[PDB]
Design a protein around this motif. Structure first.
Motif: not given
Ligand SMILES: CC(=O)N[C@H]1[C@H](O[C@H]2[C@@H](O)[C@@H](CO)O[C@@H](O[C@H]3[C@H](O)[C@@H](O)[C@H](O)O[C@@H]3CO)[C@@H]2O)O[C@H](CO)[C@@H](O)[C@@H]1O[C@@H]1O[C@H](CO)[C@H](O)[C@H](O)[C@H]1O[C@@H]1O[C@@H](C)[C@@H](O)[C@@H](O)[C@@H]1O
Length: 161
Positions: A37-38, A109-110, A127-130
């Motif tokens: 995703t990111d 978050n990372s 950083s990532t939201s997933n």
């Protein structure tokens, strides 16, 4: 003391709050990590005294031509990164090392890696939201170190096993 490992090369989702301590011999791609995703992150390993050398690396199923340079007597880990599947890989950070060790951590978050030059390498993040879905293909023997012993991992990175 004790050190969890070695584990053989494999593909899995590392738990959060555990450093992966990477121990390559002559592998070219050391680690691939993605959550699709990111986060797409890969570590390439380049030996000492290399000038303008065109080499081949396969990252996330995509075989790439990348030309590398290392004009030092130390090894270099190149951290390659992108934030979407159709983007180009960019060279984001570098770790210059005479120990040939690198690290990977999922926390908060990372995703964390080491950069700089031994014996004063330090940590930095993407950083990532997933975070939970980041899976790592590890091409090398590796060890596991809890984040509560991060200082030991930093010691290994900087002065060796
Ligand atoms: C200052 C610090 O503790 N840095 C360590 C870093 O800490 C992250 C966590 O605290 C996290 C919450 O659990 O928050 C992170 O910051 C967030 C922001 O809050 C957020 O707004 C933003 O979007 O994203 C950032 C990044 O996620 C903190 O950065 O964790 C790292 C991974 O384990 C760790 O490497 C880092 O540790 C410090 O590293 C520097 C050099 O890079 C020095 O060696 C410091 O001495 C070292 O801190 C020491 O060790 C850590 C593990 C901890 O015990 C500290 O108390 C200690 O001083």
């Amino acid at each position: 003391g004790s050190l969890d490992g070695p584990y053989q090369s494999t593909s899995f989702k590392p738990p959060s709050d555990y450093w992966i301590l990477l121990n390559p011999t002559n592998q070219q791609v050391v680690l691939e990590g993605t959550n699709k995703t990111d986060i797409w992150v890969a570590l390439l390993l380049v030996e000492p005294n290399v000038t303008n050398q065109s080499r081949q690396y396969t990252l996330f199923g995509e075989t790439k031509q990348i030309t590398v340079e290392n004009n030092t007597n130390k090894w270099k880990f190149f951290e390659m990164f992108r934030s979407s599947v159709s983007a180009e890989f960019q060279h984001k950070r570098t770790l210059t090392s005479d120990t040939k060790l690198a690290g990977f951590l999922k926390h908060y978050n990372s995703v964390w890696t080491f950069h700089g030059e031994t014996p004063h390498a330090t940590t930095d993040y993407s950083s990532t939201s997933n975070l939970s879905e980041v899976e790592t293909t590890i091409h090398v023997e590796f060890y596991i170190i809890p984040r509560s012993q991060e200082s030991k991992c930093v010691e290994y990175i900087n002065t060796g096993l």
